[PDB]
Design a binder for this molecule. Structure first.
Ligand SMILES: Cc1nn(C)c(O)c1C(=O)c1ccc2c(c1C)c(=O)n(-c1ccccc1Cl)c(=O)n2C
Ligand SMILES: [Co+2]
Length: 382
């Protein structure tokens, strides 16, 4: 069931913004590790005396990396005279966020029909305002409300290239890397209490529960009307034998925050080959691969969707496979992206649910908890 109860018109995920201490080094690392191109910048060379912001793109996926300059460069400015290209930016907030949480996501941005209306309706329905609607060069409107922890949901709407004040990056500086990633599939938050978090967000968006179908978590998925914007939220399950990874996140992050970004690939085999080649030369590492029993068990589970050769490719790359009643999911998880055991990335590709492909096809892999535990029966084979 999908009641289509969105309180304003939502289009698609627009960008993810990381708050950094040094945006240059994080952006260059992510660019090489994920195969994303430098597409736009706003920094000292563009007249921005407030913050350095670099935009990476792969298909429709947009990652923004922002860090503050010395406040002294902009001390004479006031908000009416600011050179910042993102008017919600604040030196104090950014430095406080990064000191508290380390490297992580500050903003989940969605494109909407009218960011001013989305903001107004959201706040009228319980959203905690974070930054009021601001019109940039009479062309783009941006507004922000609290999502969870110190993460904001950012609304962007365009009258008719990223944001005014950003310049396209010199082609000499923009190497056309591409490992197959094409869009953001979902963005997952960790909170101490799931119920109040879900009630808050669903309350002010009108997003509905997206249906699914030891683990250390309880979770639920909020979805937009066409189920293309997917915002899962997890809470820890305490008292278990193996400590919940959600609780570990909360401790090392100093509370709620964004846990993982799921990036859709148009060719997950190629994406993982390219990312794995670069793991030890500046890119990203992946979680340990499941035992060979897991891939032996794939035949009975998904042998009608993946050939034996395609199954052997999953084993070579350490890919996980799950299936619901509608479609099939291929997924894999990186190790944490920075120093702390907090945020990580999921790479995903979905098979089925052709209508275009409907959102959430195959679910989110919750079936792989049982399949991993059972398949670690490889102890018996030994
Ligand atoms: C769950 C879930 N719900 N929703 C809405 C999602 O989007 C997800 C995830 O994508 C998802 C799915 C399966 C997972 C893990 C995650 C994050 C995971 O983190 N670990 C895990 C747990 C602890 C340590 C290491 C790992 Cl890989 C696992 O084993 N499995 C099997
Ligand atoms: Co996921």
């Amino acid at each position: 069931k999908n009641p289509k109860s969105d309180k304003f018109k939502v289009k698609r995920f627009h960008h993810i913004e990381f708050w950094c201490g040094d945006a240059t080094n994080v952006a260059r690392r992510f660019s090489w590790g994920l195969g994303m191109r430098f597409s736009a910048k706003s920094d000292l060379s563009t007249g921005n005396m407030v913050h350095a912001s670099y935009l990476l793109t792969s298909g429709d996926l947009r990652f923004l990396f922002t860090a503050p300059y010395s406040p002294s460069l902009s001390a004479g400015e006031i908000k009416p005279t600011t050179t910042a290209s993102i008017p919600s930016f604040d030196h104090g907030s950014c430095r406080s966020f990064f000191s508290s949480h380390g490297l992580g996501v500050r903003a989940v941005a969605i494109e909407v029909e009218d960011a001013e209306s989305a903001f107004s309706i959201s706040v009228a329905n319980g959203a905690i305002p974070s930054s009021p609607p601001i019109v940039l060069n009479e062309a783009v409107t941006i507004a922000e409300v609290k999502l969870y922890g110190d993460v904001v949901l950012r609304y962007v709407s365009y009258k008719a290239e990223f944001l005014p004040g950003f310049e396209r990056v010199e082609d000499a500086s923009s190497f056309p890397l591409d490992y197959g990633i094409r869009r953001l599939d979902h963005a997952v938050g960790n909170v101490p209490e799931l119920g109040p978090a879900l009630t808050y967000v669903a309350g002010f968006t009108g997003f509905h529960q997206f249906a699914e179908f030891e683990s250390g978590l309880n979770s639920a998925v909020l979805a937009s009307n066409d189920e293309m914007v997917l915002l899962p939220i997890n809470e820890p399950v305490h008292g278990t034998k193996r400590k919940s990874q959600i609780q570990t996140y909360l401790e090392h992050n100093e509370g709620a925050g964004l846990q993982h970004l799921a990036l859709m690939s148009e060719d997950i085999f190629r994406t993982l080959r390219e990312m794995r080649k670069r793991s030890s030369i500046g890119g990203f590492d992946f979680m340990p691969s499941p035992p060979p029993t897991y891939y032996q068990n794939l035949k009975k589970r998904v042998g009608d969707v993946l050939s034996d050769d395609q199954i052997k490719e999953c084993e070579e790359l350490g890919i996980l496979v799950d299936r619901d009643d509608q479609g099939t999911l291929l997924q894999i998880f990186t190790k944490p992206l920075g120093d702390r055991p907090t945020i990580f990335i999921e790479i995903i590709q979905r098979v089925g649910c052709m209508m275009y492909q409907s959102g959430g096809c195959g679910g989110f892999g919750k079936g792989n908890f049982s399949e991993l535990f059972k398949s670690i029966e490889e102890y018996e084979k030994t």
